[PDB]
RNA sequence: AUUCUAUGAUUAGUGUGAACGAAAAUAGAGCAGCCUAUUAAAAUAAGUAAAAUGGCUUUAAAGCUGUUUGAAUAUUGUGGG
RNA sequence: CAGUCGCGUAAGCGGGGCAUAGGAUCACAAGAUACAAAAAGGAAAGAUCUUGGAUUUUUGGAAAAGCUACGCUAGGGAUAA
């Protein structure tokens, strides 16, 4: 229950995304990550 | 990547190199040795600078003006393949992969 | 090769079979491992088969 | 049209598995159509079709069914699949 | 090798951690792929890729408490008095 697996989505709208894990005691996460369906550096946001 | 090293060398005082002499150090010589050019002539490096060349766009029509050849020639990486002999396959569904075991090919074929 | 038909014949007495065991007395399924769980299982079927696709009769210009 | 045999088919498909398992079509055996049925019957079908629910069958369809409810009128496109 | 990002004068390094201790399928859930779509147009249910939730701890993965001196059968002397 300490961890739990975060969903990092693209915000090119592109549907891709990528899963980490993050204590609940923490802000969520943000980080500038490769898309492969637009093959480009953008964005990463926490689903919720 | 081709390395062109630019050598500057001292000759000694009074030592001047004959142009003929020069020219004939280069007229066999595929393999040119700096090595050797120098204890030869009996020079001393002093002076050194560097670049570097690669094929790029513009390699082609360069070599077309000067009548270079070898611009039609491409080198791909040597490949090492296995150095194990081939094996039979081992298992429960490697050996029954042939029509003997048809009746069990259920649990055979098109196992993800 | 006629087994259980005498000692010389090199097929008497167990026609092959051993000493006692299951594959003596009975029969083992085919689809036995042991217990292990079969590839089929542990990875799963991969794909599907198309029921609907056509089956085209191939002819070459040679 | 029905019936019997084989193929289709250790198939489609179902099932966690073990296993279970069609139809179209094909071939053969027979062949027969009718309501004026070669034995004496319909004024063309309503608590029916169908739905919910509990089950059977089953691939979720179709088919059988207890309980509670409950349609339409023909290609001038009415009803079932 | 391709794609495209970071650091660095540069050469170059980077596909987590100095190294050696975290289980699948199935089912379910969330994204993508445009494959097939049981008359046809759609869809449903499927397929491929990515991802998530396990003392599945008998950890290659069953949802599982005892008595028999009333006891029975097949075996072992492969383990006792
Ligand atoms: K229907
Ligand atoms: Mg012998
Ligand atoms: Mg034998
Ligand atoms: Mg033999
Ligand atoms: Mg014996
Ligand atoms: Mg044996
Ligand atoms: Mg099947
Ligand atoms: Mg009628
Ligand atoms: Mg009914
Ligand atoms: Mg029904
Ligand atoms: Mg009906
Ligand atoms: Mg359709
Ligand atoms: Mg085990
Ligand atoms: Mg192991
Ligand atoms: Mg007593």
């Known amino acids: 229950s300490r961890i739990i697996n975060v969903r990092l989505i693209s915000m090119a709208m592109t549907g891709y995304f990528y899963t980490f894990t993050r204590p609940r005691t923490s802000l969520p996460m943000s980080m500038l990550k490769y898309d492969p369906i637009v093959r480009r550096k953008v964005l990463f946001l926490e689903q919720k | ?112 | 090769i006629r087994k259980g038909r005498g000692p010389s014949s090199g097929y008497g007495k167990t026609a092959g079979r051993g000493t006692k065991g299951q594959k003596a007395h009975g029969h083992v399924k085919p689809w036995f491992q042991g217990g292990q769980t079969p590839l089929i299982v542990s990875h799963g079927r991969k794909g599907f088969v198309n029921q609907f696709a056509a089956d085209m009769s191939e002819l070459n210009l040679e």
């Not at chain 2, 194990?84 to 490697?94: C, D, H, L, T, V």
């Open chain 2, 1 to 112: 990547y081709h390395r062109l090293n630019v050598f500057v060398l001292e000759q000694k005082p009074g030592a001047k190199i004959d142009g003929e002499a020069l020219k004939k150090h280069l007229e066999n010589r595929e393999n040119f040795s700096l090595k050797g050019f120098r204890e030869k002539f009996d020079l001393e490096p002093v002076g050194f600078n560097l670049f570097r060349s690669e094929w790029d766009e513009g390699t082609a029509e360069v070599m077309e003006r000067h009548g270079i050849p070898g611009a039609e020639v491409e080198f791909k990486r040597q490949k090492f393949a296995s150095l194990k002999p081939p094996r039979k396959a081992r298992g429960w569904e490697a050996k029954r992969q042939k029509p003997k075991y048809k009746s069990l090919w259920k649990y055979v074929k098109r196992i993800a």
